[PDB]
Amino acid sequence: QRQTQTINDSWKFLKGECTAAADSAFDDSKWTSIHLPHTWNTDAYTEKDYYRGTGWYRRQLTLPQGWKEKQIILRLDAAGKSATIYINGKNVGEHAGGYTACSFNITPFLSFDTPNTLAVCVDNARQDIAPISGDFTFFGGIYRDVWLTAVPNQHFNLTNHGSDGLFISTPQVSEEQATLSIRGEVKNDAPEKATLELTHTIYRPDGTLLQTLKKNIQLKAGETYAFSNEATPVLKPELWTPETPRLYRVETTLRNRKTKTLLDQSNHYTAFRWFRFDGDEGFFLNGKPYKLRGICRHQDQKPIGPALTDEMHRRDFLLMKEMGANFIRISHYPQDDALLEMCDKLGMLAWEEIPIIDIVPNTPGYGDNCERNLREMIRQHYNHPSIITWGYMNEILLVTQRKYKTEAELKPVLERTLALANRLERVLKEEDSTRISTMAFHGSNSYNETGLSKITDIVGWNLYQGWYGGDLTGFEKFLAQQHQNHPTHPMIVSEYGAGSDKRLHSLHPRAFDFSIEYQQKYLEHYLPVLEDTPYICGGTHWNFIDFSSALRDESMPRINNKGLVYADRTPKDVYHYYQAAWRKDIPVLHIASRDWTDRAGVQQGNAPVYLPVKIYTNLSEVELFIDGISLGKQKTENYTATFEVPFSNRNPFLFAQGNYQGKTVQDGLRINFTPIPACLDANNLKGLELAVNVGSQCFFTSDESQLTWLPDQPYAAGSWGYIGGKEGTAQTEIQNTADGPLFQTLRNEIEGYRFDAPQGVYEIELLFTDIFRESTFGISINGEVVEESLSPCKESGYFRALRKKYYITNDKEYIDIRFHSTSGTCFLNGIKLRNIY
């Protein structure tokens, strides 16, 4: 019989090279105790320069005596980026690739009456292994399951590109009938021949038997045997869709032909579906038009990296499925079996790819490792009915076009690129003729002009109009252009998204302020275009999660914040916009304010402060209440509705309801509101901490201090605000603060800041960061100099926070701060006023 179990436990780990670390008798007691899955790159969640290099893993293998006559296969499901396996000091094998499995028959190197030592040397510094470039962290270590499989001396091949050795397909599929094809290899590692019986048992979705195939076979000592048995056509077969994931189990059994002793067994699922892509009418599943509703998903989770356990992969999947998605771009690398098991069983169409990104370098051996990862991916994930397309390149021209400008420089790189591309297209269709090929392009017509877009069956456009420049309307314009010029290339929008940050909100959202509201604006424009345009087969949203990308700065450094859920898998409000549009079966009513629970605003006297509250819903009409008071009904358009809500009380309870298919549907939540006075006097100063996000139109709420910094406002008599200057913005990371975004916007060429305020003693905090890589200025308040010559970049350097507090005695009816430029410009990034006496 076959025994499969993990050996994820009882490991020792050492970061860095170490000579003698493979030896049986090496002393490792001072090493770190760990448990797989593991990564040594949690540093990538704070450090841009994460450790790329070597690390050593050691674990004892003490073999069970019942395995004395079995073959022992070791499987590493992934290790980034490469691994060399030692058993008792003997090199057993090596693997190149961070996202595909590898397996080794380790029987010869094992003892059965002594301890055996397993030692894995892992390296994520190697430049001959994909990816070498791309918008994510190249995490090092053994971050998927590690298995031991013991099998009898005759068994199915388990050392074919780390796969299961068996491959099931369906050559023909129609409403009326379909045909099955069960192929694989049997291996005999006994010293003598053997006569076997092979059995293929096929079960309907409902568990009952549909058919048994039997074929007797013989193998001589040390031979591997290739079979390929068609099956009786299945009549009126139950077809698979994401919505009806009908699966047929196929159980393949290997027994000794005389004694009928069971030897080895291996189960797989199969399904019956066909599909095509149409440059004019889109995607067709089982003959019917089918809009692909997709998201892409990276595999990491802050702060553990990609060392996820399998229930986390399943949790991720439940979230994408409850949102209503029917398609997933598994990108940019092949992901855990735990995930693909769910796309088959619970139902999701799948696109899977290997990470060849940005630029084909002239690195010796790169192309060859790429082709092996393509074969590994395809052979390992071949039996997953959910997968309908493989891909191998994503934006392969992006860095190439940035780094090479002349036609002379482009020439050799475009040739390398077009070569590797056609090569892999051939490797793909040689490994699998049942699925579609695909490539993903950044938003450039040069993928057409260079020839790259004639290569695959379908094309993916990564489109960011309205985020990385352009207009939101350029998105549908870019796609209509591609469709008139290239009407036979069927298109998927394989990427679109906008960053958001829970700390930032705006009544006037713009791109690259990273407010919750701009990302919503961007997605609310993109999604109907995807749903209502026939030559768009679908879109895959980039990305389902906020994910690790150590090289990024922007509002959340080390993080790509374009997710629909946060890194911990709490959903952003906009997740429920997708749900409203994609789940018609249930009611969706979501007050879109879980991202905006700590609100502030400038208050005229005692009048209520108006701030928008948004609702995502599939109901047609919704009514919103604040502390019991109705704010009327509103008809939904585009699954959304905004109310202008009067905030007053400090802990208001928001409540929404509406009718859906005859049932009443409700939602509610409490939030926090703090009014800030527009006109300071001695009463409203008690307990006031007036804090302004100078140079920005966003409310910034610290997640460290819970303080909200108000949008900048110009000075008006009776009130407070800035005098002169223009808004300035950076996306570079700011040292020495948790509150990056507050320092990344500033009022440049500022002339003053004024507070009309009563006489007294005041605490003034000034926030500076020089983002213009020289500025020197003096600061006076009510005619007294508080800085003679402040130069933030000479004190602290560029992109580094300075917070300076001053105690100020106001003997006037105002607090007038003036800036006196002497070099460069005057700038101010934030200001906070408190009355002390």
Ligand X SMILES: N[C@H]1[C@H](O)[C@H](O)[C@@H](O)[C@H](O)[C@H]1C(=O)O
Sign of torsion, CA 482 484 488 493? positive
493 HSE (CA, 13 A, CB side): 31
269 or 514, CB closer to ligand X? 514
Least spacing, CB of residue 468 vs ligand X, in Å: 7
Mask of contacts with its own copies, 599-638, x by CB under 8 A?
----------------------------xx----------
Per-residue tokens: 652: 């208001």
505 contributes a contact to ligand X by CB under 6 A = no
Query: Taking the CB of residue 113, how many other CB atoms lie within 10 A of it?
Result: 7
554 contributes a contact to ligand X by CB under 6 A = no
327 or 722, CB closer to K ion? 722
Element (H, E) at 778: strand 776-781
708 contributes a contact to K ion by CB under 5 A = no
| Binding-site member from 28, 123, 135, 476 for ligand X (CB under 6 A) | 135
804 contributes a contact to its own copies by CB under 8 A = yes
506 contributes a contact to K ion by CB under 5 A = no
Q: Which residue type does 493 have?
A: V
735 contributes a contact to its own copies by CB under 8 A = yes
Is the bond leading into 171 cis (omega within 30 degrees of zero)?
A: no
Q: Rounded to whole angstroms, how far apart are CA atoms 297 and 319?
A: 11
Positions 68 through 107 that interact with K ion (CB under 5 A): none
| Binding-site member from 159, 543, 745, 775 for K ion (CB under 5 A) | 745
Positions 674 through 693 that interact with K ion (CB under 5 A): 693
Which of helix, strand or coil describes residue 179? coil
Mask of contacts with ligand X, 437-466, x by CB under 6 A?
-------------------------x----
Positions 513 through 552 that interact with its own copies (CB under 8 A): none
134 or 728, CB closer to ligand X? 134
Query: Taking the CB of residue 407, how many other CB atoms lie within 10 A of it?
Result: 8
400 contributes a contact to ligand X by CB under 6 A = no
Positions 736 through 765 that interact with its own copies (CB under 8 A): 736-738, 761
Least spacing, CB of residue 707 vs K ion, in Å: 14
Q: How many helices (H) and strands (E) does the chain have?
A: 11, 57
Q: Rounded to whole angstroms, how far apart are CA atoms 432 and 390?
A: 9
Mask of contacts with K ion, 812-831, x by CB under 5 A?
-----------------x--
701 contributes a contact to K ion by CB under 5 A = no
Is 189 labelled a binding residue?
no
Residues 6+ apart with CB under 8 A from 83: 76, 94, 95, 102, 120, 121, 122, 123, 142
270 binds, among K ion, ligand X, Ca ion, none (CB under 5 to 8 A by kind): none
| Binding-site member from 638, 788, 812, 823 for its own copies (CB under 8 A) | 788
Q: Rounded to whole angstroms, how far apart are CA atoms 321 and 333?
A: 20
Which of helix, strand or coil describes residue 216? strand
Q: Rounded to whole angstroms, how far apart are CA atoms 305 and 137?
A: 9
Residue 9 is classified by DSSP as: S
425 contributes a contact to Ca ion by CB under 5 A = no
Least spacing, CB of residue 679 vs ligand X, in Å: 44
Positions 301 through 330 that interact with Ca ion (CB under 5 A): 310
DSSP string, 311-341: HHHHHHHHHHHHTT--EEEE-SS---HHHHH
33 or 362, CB closer to its own copies? 33
Is 739 labelled a binding residue?
no
User: Is residue 376 within 8 Å of residue 100, measured between CB atoms?
Assistant: yes
Mask of contacts with its own copies, 335-374, x by CB under 8 A?
------x---xx----------------------------
Residue 829 CA to its chain's centroid (Å): 32
610 binds, among ligand X, Ca ion, its own copies, none (CB under 5 to 8 A by kind): none
User: Is residue 452 within 8 Å of residue 392, measured between CB atoms?
Assistant: no
Residue carrying structure tokens 């979501």: 590
User: Is residue 146 within 8 Å of residue 36, measured between CB atoms?
Assistant: yes
81 or 302, CB closer to its own copies? 302
239 or 589, CB closer to its own copies? 589
560 contributes a contact to ligand X by CB under 6 A = yes
Mask of contacts with Ca ion, 142-171, x by CB under 5 A?
---x--------------------------
Q: At residue 410, what are phi and psi to the nearest 5 degrees?
A: -60, -35
Q: At residue 600, what are phi and psi to the nearest 5 degrees?
A: -140, 165
Using the contact rule CB under 5 A, the part of the chain among 206-214, 334-342, 685-693, 741-749 near Ca ion is: 334-342
Residues 6+ apart with CB under 8 A from 581: 324, 527, 531, 618, 639
670 contributes a contact to its own copies by CB under 8 A = yes
Element (H, E) at 57: strand 54-61
Per-residue tokens: 8: 């994820």
Of all residues in the shown chain, the one whose CB is closest to ligand X is 135
Active-site residue flag, 47 = no
681 contributes a contact to its own copies by CB under 8 A = no
Least spacing, CB of residue 464 vs ligand X, in Å: 7
Q: Rounded to whole angstroms, how far apart are CA atoms 87 and 110?
A: 7
- Catalytic one of 353, 371, 395, 495: 395
Q: Rounded to whole angstroms, how far apart are CA atoms 438 and 389?
A: 7
Per-residue tokens: 482: 């591609």
Is 145 labelled a binding residue?
yes
668 contributes a contact to its own copies by CB under 8 A = yes
Least spacing, CB of residue 677 vs Ca ion, in Å: 25
User: Is residue 254 within 8 Å of residue 156, measured between CB atoms?
Assistant: yes
338 contributes a contact to Ca ion by CB under 5 A = yes
| Binding-site member from 135, 358, 667, 733 for its own copies (CB under 8 A) | 667
User: Is residue 142 within 8 Å of residue 120, measured between CB atoms?
Assistant: yes
672 contributes a contact to its own copies by CB under 8 A = no
336 contributes a contact to Ca ion by CB under 5 A = yes
Residue 794 CA to its chain's centroid (Å): 39
Listed residue (563, 24, 72) closest to 300, CA to CA? 563
- Residue 499 Rama label (left phi>0; alpha psi -120 to 50; beta): beta
> End-to-end alpha-carbon separation of the chain, Å?
83
395 binds, among K ion, its own copies, ligand X, none (CB under 5 to 8 A by kind): ligand X
Listed residue (758, 764, 793) closest to 780, CA to CA? 764
77 or 135, CB closer to ligand X? 135
395 contributes a contact to ligand X by CB under 6 A = yes
Q: Rounded to whole angstroms, how far apart are CA atoms 602 and 836?
A: 21
Least spacing, CB of residue 491 vs its own copies, in Å: 33
Q: Which residues are annotated as a binding site for Ca(2+)?
A: 145, 310, 336
Q: Which residues are annotated as a binding site?
A: 145, 310, 336
Q: Supply the residues annotated as catalytic.
A: 395
- Please give the residue ranges that form the binding site for K ion (CB under 5 A): 693-696, 745, 829
- Please give the residue ranges that form the binding site for Ca ion (CB under 5 A): 145, 310, 336, 338
- Please give the residue ranges that form the binding site for ligand X (CB under 6 A): 134-135, 394-395, 462, 495, 497, 542, 560, 562
